[PDB]
Enzyme design. Structure first.
Site, PDB file in Angstrom:
ATOM      1  N   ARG A 153     -33.686 -42.212  76.325  1.00  0.00           N
ATOM      2  CA  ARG A 153     -33.849 -41.824  74.926  1.00  0.00           C
ATOM      3  C   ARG A 153     -35.222 -41.261  74.577  1.00  0.00           C
ATOM      4  O   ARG A 153     -35.405 -40.889  73.409  1.00  0.00           O
ATOM      5  CB  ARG A 153     -33.564 -42.999  73.996  1.00  0.00           C
ATOM      6  CG  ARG A 153     -32.108 -43.406  73.895  1.00  0.00           C
ATOM      7  CD  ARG A 153     -32.024 -44.656  73.053  1.00  0.00           C
ATOM      8  NE  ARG A 153     -32.334 -45.858  73.839  1.00  0.00           N
ATOM      9  CZ  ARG A 153     -32.547 -47.063  73.313  1.00  0.00           C
ATOM     10  NH1 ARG A 153     -32.515 -47.236  71.996  1.00  0.00           N
ATOM     11  NH2 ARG A 153     -32.803 -48.098  74.113  1.00  0.00           N
ATOM     12  N   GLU A 197     -27.285 -43.627  89.184  1.00  0.00           N
ATOM     13  CA  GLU A 197     -25.931 -43.494  88.665  1.00  0.00           C
ATOM     14  C   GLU A 197     -24.987 -42.984  89.749  1.00  0.00           C
ATOM     15  O   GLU A 197     -23.843 -43.440  89.855  1.00  0.00           O
ATOM     16  CB  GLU A 197     -25.903 -42.553  87.451  1.00  0.00           C
ATOM     17  CG  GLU A 197     -26.746 -43.019  86.257  1.00  0.00           C
ATOM     18  CD  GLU A 197     -26.624 -42.084  85.056  1.00  0.00           C
ATOM     19  OE1 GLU A 197     -25.626 -42.210  84.315  1.00  0.00           O
ATOM     20  OE2 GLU A 197     -27.518 -41.229  84.869  1.00  0.00           O
TER      21      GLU A 197
HETATM   22  C1  HEM Z   1     -31.110 -36.634  79.025  1.00  0.00           C
HETATM   23  C2  HEM Z   1     -31.053 -37.497  80.057  1.00  0.00           C
HETATM   24  C3  HEM Z   1     -30.284 -38.845  80.000  1.00  0.00           C
HETATM   25  C4  HEM Z   1     -30.426 -39.808  80.897  1.00  0.00           C
HETATM   26  C5  HEM Z   1     -31.369 -39.792  82.123  1.00  0.00           C
HETATM   27  C6  HEM Z   1     -29.558 -40.904  80.534  1.00  0.00           C
HETATM   28  C7  HEM Z   1     -29.460 -42.079  81.236  1.00  0.00           C
HETATM   29  C8  HEM Z   1     -28.524 -43.044  80.962  1.00  0.00           C
HETATM   30  C9  HEM Z   1     -28.111 -44.078  81.884  1.00  0.00           C
HETATM   31  C10 HEM Z   1     -28.682 -44.265  83.309  1.00  0.00           C
HETATM   32  C11 HEM Z   1     -27.186 -44.805  81.251  1.00  0.00           C
HETATM   33  C12 HEM Z   1     -26.441 -46.006  81.836  1.00  0.00           C
HETATM   34  C13 HEM Z   1     -25.063 -45.439  82.146  1.00  0.00           C
HETATM   35  C14 HEM Z   1     -24.377 -46.225  83.222  1.00  0.00           C
HETATM   36  O1  HEM Z   1     -25.037 -47.020  83.936  1.00  0.00           O
HETATM   37  O2  HEM Z   1     -23.157 -46.032  83.365  1.00  0.00           O
HETATM   38  C15 HEM Z   1     -26.955 -44.249  79.922  1.00  0.00           C
HETATM   39  C16 HEM Z   1     -26.097 -44.731  78.958  1.00  0.00           C
HETATM   40  C17 HEM Z   1     -25.862 -44.126  77.737  1.00  0.00           C
HETATM   41  N1  HEM Z   1     -26.433 -42.948  77.299  1.00  0.00           N
HETATM   42 FE1  HEM Z   1     -27.932 -41.941  78.164  1.00  0.00          FE
HETATM   43  N2  HEM Z   1     -28.884 -40.582  79.375  1.00  0.00           N
HETATM   44  C18 HEM Z   1     -29.297 -39.296  79.028  1.00  0.00           C
HETATM   45  C19 HEM Z   1     -28.852 -38.575  77.945  1.00  0.00           C
HETATM   46  C20 HEM Z   1     -28.066 -39.082  76.937  1.00  0.00           C
HETATM   47  C21 HEM Z   1     -27.592 -38.353  75.785  1.00  0.00           C
HETATM   48  C22 HEM Z   1     -27.894 -36.847  75.566  1.00  0.00           C
HETATM   49  C23 HEM Z   1     -26.851 -39.195  75.043  1.00  0.00           C
HETATM   50  C24 HEM Z   1     -26.116 -38.972  73.698  1.00  0.00           C
HETATM   51  C25 HEM Z   1     -26.419 -37.927  72.904  1.00  0.00           C
HETATM   52  C26 HEM Z   1     -26.852 -40.476  75.707  1.00  0.00           C
HETATM   53  C27 HEM Z   1     -26.220 -41.602  75.249  1.00  0.00           C
HETATM   54  C28 HEM Z   1     -25.914 -42.683  76.032  1.00  0.00           C
HETATM   55  C29 HEM Z   1     -25.021 -43.758  75.668  1.00  0.00           C
HETATM   56  C30 HEM Z   1     -24.231 -43.897  74.351  1.00  0.00           C
HETATM   57  C31 HEM Z   1     -24.990 -44.615  76.685  1.00  0.00           C
HETATM   58  C32 HEM Z   1     -24.170 -45.920  76.717  1.00  0.00           C
HETATM   59  C33 HEM Z   1     -22.803 -45.720  77.352  1.00  0.00           C
HETATM   60  C34 HEM Z   1     -22.015 -47.007  77.255  1.00  0.00           C
HETATM   61  O3  HEM Z   1     -22.418 -47.952  76.532  1.00  0.00           O
HETATM   62  O4  HEM Z   1     -20.967 -47.068  77.918  1.00  0.00           O
HETATM   63  N3  HEM Z   1     -27.607 -40.383  76.853  1.00  0.00           N
HETATM   64  N4  HEM Z   1     -27.797 -43.174  79.785  1.00  0.00           N
HETATM   65  C1  LIG Z   2     -25.372 -38.751  78.432  1.00  0.00           C
HETATM   66  C2  LIG Z   2     -25.479 -39.543  79.714  1.00  0.00           C
HETATM   67  C3  LIG Z   2     -26.397 -39.213  80.699  1.00  0.00           C
HETATM   68  C4  LIG Z   2     -26.431 -39.979  81.859  1.00  0.00           C
HETATM   69  N1  LIG Z   2     -27.315 -39.692  82.845  1.00  0.00           N
HETATM   70  N2  LIG Z   2     -25.565 -41.006  82.017  1.00  0.00           N
HETATM   71  C5  LIG Z   2     -24.672 -41.359  81.073  1.00  0.00           C
HETATM   72  C6  LIG Z   2     -23.801 -42.435  81.259  1.00  0.00           C
HETATM   73  C7  LIG Z   2     -22.905 -42.780  80.248  1.00  0.00           C
HETATM   74  C8  LIG Z   2     -21.877 -43.838  80.414  1.00  0.00           C
HETATM   75  C9  LIG Z   2     -21.734 -44.481  81.625  1.00  0.00           C
HETATM   76  C10 LIG Z   2     -20.727 -45.422  81.826  1.00  0.00           C
HETATM   77  C11 LIG Z   2     -19.788 -45.674  80.838  1.00  0.00           C
HETATM   78  O1  LIG Z   2     -18.788 -46.598  81.043  1.00  0.00           O
HETATM   79  C12 LIG Z   2     -18.799 -47.487  82.165  1.00  0.00           C
HETATM   80  C13 LIG Z   2     -17.606 -48.410  82.065  1.00  0.00           C
HETATM   81  C14 LIG Z   2     -16.919 -48.617  80.865  1.00  0.00           C
HETATM   82  S1  LIG Z   2     -15.644 -49.729  81.231  1.00  0.00           S
HETATM   83  C15 LIG Z   2     -16.013 -49.906  82.909  1.00  0.00           C
HETATM   84  N3  LIG Z   2     -17.097 -49.110  83.139  1.00  0.00           N
HETATM   85  C16 LIG Z   2     -19.867 -44.971  79.644  1.00  0.00           C
HETATM   86  C17 LIG Z   2     -18.839 -45.214  78.549  1.00  0.00           C
HETATM   87  N4  LIG Z   2     -17.679 -44.327  78.713  1.00  0.00           N
HETATM   88  C18 LIG Z   2     -20.887 -44.039  79.454  1.00  0.00           C
HETATM   89  C19 LIG Z   2     -22.870 -42.018  79.090  1.00  0.00           C
HETATM   90  C20 LIG Z   2     -23.718 -40.942  78.912  1.00  0.00           C
HETATM   91  C21 LIG Z   2     -24.630 -40.622  79.901  1.00  0.00           C
END
Ligand code: HEM
Ligand SMILES: Cc1cc(N)nc2cc(-c3ccc(OCc4cscn4)c(CN)c3)ccc12
Ligand code: HEM
Ligand SMILES: Cc1cc(N)nc2cc(-c3ccc(OCc4cscn4)c(CN)c3)ccc12
Ligand SMILES: C[C@H](O)[C@H](O)[C@H]1CNc2nc(N)[nH]c(=O)c2N1
Ligand SMILES: C[C@H](O)[C@H](O)[C@H]1CNc2nc(N)[nH]c(=O)c2N1
Ligand SMILES: [Zn+2]
Lengths: 416, 411
Positions: free
Chosen positions: A117, A291
């Site tokens: 973020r 990831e």
């Molecule tokens: C720009 C580089 C970004 C990086 C490096 C990044 C990195 C991450 C990582 C490593 C996670 C954990 C996901 C997982 O382990 O499955 C995550 C979750 C998340 N990211 Fe970011 N993200 C980025 C951009 C964004 C953007 C652009 C958004 C929304 C506009 C966003 C919203 C979220 C949300 C909502 C989650 C939670 C997903 C969930 O609860 O299932 N991210 N992000």
């Molecule tokens: C914008 C962005 C960048 C980035 N580098 N990584 C991201 C990862 C997520 C992310 C990763 C796992 C998720 O669900 C795992 C799950 C749910 S139930 C059993 N497993 C979800 C929810 N659908 C979102 C979302 C956005 C990302």
């Protein structure tokens, strides 16, 4: 609730003071007697009534006008009155483009599970609220993919389709990400491709997709406009940037035939702004290496490649106290970062990303009074304590605008 | 009411009913989770009896004799004592039961599959620091057991009025000294730099080395603490070497075999035992990841990555992650080669998952703190990473307490 809450960093001794938690508006799931911090997720006729929508809209409009330093102004009081009239006559309202863009950026700023973020204010917002059909959704999504990919210089973006009305006309992307690989259950119980996507893959096949039945087949888009039955579309393959995984030292690593796609674009979440619900809002960033290198590749229920990599590394795999799993895990993640960097596709390692998040968190505490953070998600899935977030105390709480979970659409769709 | 926890690799769903029996707070609210806060913030005859009754009830319920003759008698028995003394005394059976269940309820401990195998040493007749030192030497000798480590706890007299506290001032029974250098840096273990100076300030002649076993600082009945050297033949240590890298031993690393935490408070039925050192055996990462590689600890990552001749110019080479795995291989290899009990984080977490299944079957749940249970390296290639856990507070329990040097009025 207490007005000031302290968080400590146990490596640096830095203490920060949180006041922003007082603005939280939805439930964590914890109670005074139980903590649900490690629980992953703690009716379509139901939509916000007039009476529920009024306070939610005022809350967001106030927050917007306070952010542009026009709180209490003529333009503020007039926007309030125009929103109230819209809810009065139509039971809903429409956001201005400025308010839409502010709301999307703040849902990201507020996403407590996101380590990336520090970038929240550099989000390209595509307004797709004029879309009416699944073909139109396909066009918007193709444009999003091309813009965000940017030939490897990835740019964060979100495309926002029309908000929910009565709940029987929802726009939905049935895919969980815009770009993912198919998974195929075999009669003998094994799986080809990505086991995470077996269910969705089976739905695509029933909807008419002809599957190539390979290890890395990009899935089609399955797109639902205006509550209609979803429709299938193939993403033009020249829009799908992919990286072949090789290792800077192990020449045999390429012979494993591994690749991954460059663009992580989550498409199954719901965007809530001012009590309005945007059920189709695909958003994308760029990857943190773990990831792919830890979760996508080494999860037992995913591609599960630790064994084959350990073999080719000539490791003793009989006693786990050799840490043969840990050693192969590092080499895999070295390879993922080397392949993305070599092909000039944006990626960030978990050291750099967590260091940036600490600096981001400290800035948010200073300028905003806090930064909600979910330690269980922020700490990377490998090498936790050798990243600075491991030692950082965090407070988790839910602010709005927010990205939320929603049920899978095949569980709720009424087929025409 | 009934709460479910899913494992996302194995799809196993367990059902928690045990949490309904908590009455102490976690610190979280419906709107703020404090699950990553390390410490989220004297009794009286009025406060003390309900707590005593609760514990007596659960003890007699545990031994299948609820409401029986012995149960009713003990309840009335404890009634008269709290009344006429402002406190009461546990039976030996109750002390043992309470100590094992404080371990069983420690949500942050991945080792609890062993919880009912605990040697309980009753030291409630101790009156002096010499007495404490004797009891502690016996604890160390018994638990060390020539490398075949045995879990043990030694329980000193309970708090009375708060002015007569038994305290072990060391944070662990065996730890290495820390010395702030003229050139601003640190020799030894930085975690103990403060305690090491309180020992020097009290008369301890420091050998100013890298691995100097600290003396014991023991407070009996509220009096000033007194220094004691643990006899060295009781202190088992392991020189760390690598099975492949013959240069690893030249690093001059070693550690002690016995982890014995001595600064926590044991609570049983409203009674507080402020001196209760308890010990088990190490999980390899406690030494190899935290003690050696924390920036605020021994911080040997860069030295190791040097002798591995790794490119340390960019973080994305994961040079830190490679050196960390090799250090932890060396620790496990060294203890095993010396036949000193140790468990790796793969075996330990899989045992914990099996423990969790057991507790859900026979007890209706297992309080567990994901933030502490998941090891500090290779998290998602251990099964606990993918295991949902519910955290809640059951009593008897181990609690935190202030450092003695922040509260003790000297003389
Ligand atoms: C720009 C580089 C970004 C990086 C490096 C990044 C990195 C991450 C990582 C490593 C996670 C954990 C996901 C997982 O382990 O499955 C995550 C979750 C998340 N990211 Fe970011 N993200 C980025 C951009 C964004 C953007 C652009 C958004 C929304 C506009 C966003 C919203 C979220 C949300 C909502 C989650 C939670 C997903 C969930 O609860 O299932 N991210 N992000
Ligand atoms: C914008 C962005 C960048 C980035 N580098 N990584 C991201 C990862 C997520 C992310 C990763 C796992 C998720 O669900 C795992 C799950 C749910 S139930 C059993 N497993 C979800 C929810 N659908 C979102 C979302 C956005 C990302
Ligand atoms: C027998 C083998 C044992 C192993 C392998 C083990 C392992 C661990 C580990 C790895 C931790 C996390 C500590 C850290 O990361 O700093 C922990 C915490 C803890 N253990 Fe165990 N443990 C064992 C025995 C015991 C015993 C015998 C007791 C008490 C009778 C106990 C009580 C606790 C408590 C109370 C904590 C939490 C400490 C805190 O909250 O600061 N453990 N254990
Ligand atoms: C019995 C046993 C066996 C074993 N193998 N490991 C153990 C680790 C602990 C342990 C670990 C961290 C702790 O506090 C960290 C802290 C507090 S404030 C800044 N940091 C404490 C409390 N002093 C105990 C306790 C018992 C163990
Ligand atoms: C059980 C546990 O909550 C679950 O495995 C979580 C743990 N932390 C995580 N952290 C991230 N970043 N992503 C995840 O999918 C998970 N999974
Ligand atoms: C900030 C965070 O709560 C703190 O670093 C915790 C995290 N998890 C931990 N887990 C274990 N096992 N031991 C610890 O000392 C810590 N420290
Ligand atoms: Zn909580």
């Amino acid at each position: 609730c207490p007005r000031f809450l302290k968080v400590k960093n146990w490596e640096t001794e830095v203490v920060l003071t949180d006041t922003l938690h007082l603005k939280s508006t939805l439930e964590t799931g914890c109670t005074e007697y139980i903590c649900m911090g490690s629980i992953m997720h703690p009716r379509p006729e139901d939509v916000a009534t007039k009476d529920q929508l009024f306070p939610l809209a005022k809350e967001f409009i106030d927050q917007y006008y306070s952010s542009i330093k026009r709180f209490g102004s003529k333009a503020h009081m007039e926007r309030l009155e125009e929103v109230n009239k819209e809810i009065d006559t139509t039971s809903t309202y429409q956001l201005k483009d400025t308010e839409l863009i502010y709301g999307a950026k703040h849902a990201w700023r507020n996403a407590s599970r996101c380590v990336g973020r520090i970038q929240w204010s550099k989000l390209q917002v595509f307004d797709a609220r004029d879309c009416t059909t699944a073909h139109g959704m396909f066009n918007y999504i193709c444009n999003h993919v091309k813009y965000a990919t940017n030939k490897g210089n990835l740019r964060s973006a979100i495309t926002i389709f029309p908000q929910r009305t009565d709940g029987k006309h929802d726009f939905r992307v049935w895919n969980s990400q815009l770009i993912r690989y198919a998974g195929y259950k075999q009669p003998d119980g094994s799986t080809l491709g990505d086991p995470a996507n077996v269910q969705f893959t089976e739905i695509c096949i029933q909807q008419g997709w002809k599957p190539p039945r390979g290890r890395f087949d990009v899935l089609p888009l399955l797109l639902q406009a205006n509550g209609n039955d979803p429709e299938l579309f193939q993403i033009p393959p020249e829009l799908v940037l992919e990286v072949p995984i090789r290792h800077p030292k192990f020449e045999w690593f390429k012979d494993l035939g591994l690749k991954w796609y460059g663009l992580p674009a989550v498409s199954n979440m719901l965007l809530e702004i001012g009590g309005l619900e945007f059920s189709a809002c695909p958003f994308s960033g760029w990857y943190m290496g773990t990831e792919i290198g830890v979760r996508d590749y080494c999860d037992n229920s995913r591609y599960n490649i630790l064994e084959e990599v350990a073999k080719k590394m000539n490791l003793d795999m009989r006693k786990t106290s050799s840490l043969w799993k840990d050693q192969a895990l590092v080499e895999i993640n070295i390879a993922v970062l080397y392949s993305f960097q070599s092909d000039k596709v944006t990626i960030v390692d978990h050291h750099s990303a967590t260091e940036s998040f600490i600096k981001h968190m400290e800035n948010e505490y200073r300028c905003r009074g806090g930064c909600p953070a979910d330690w269980v998600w922020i700490v990377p899935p490998m090498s936790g304590s050798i990243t600075p977030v491991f030692h950082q105390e965090m407070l988790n709480y839910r602010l709005t605008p927010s990205f939320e979970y929603q049920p899978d659409p095949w569980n709720t769709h009424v087929w025409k």
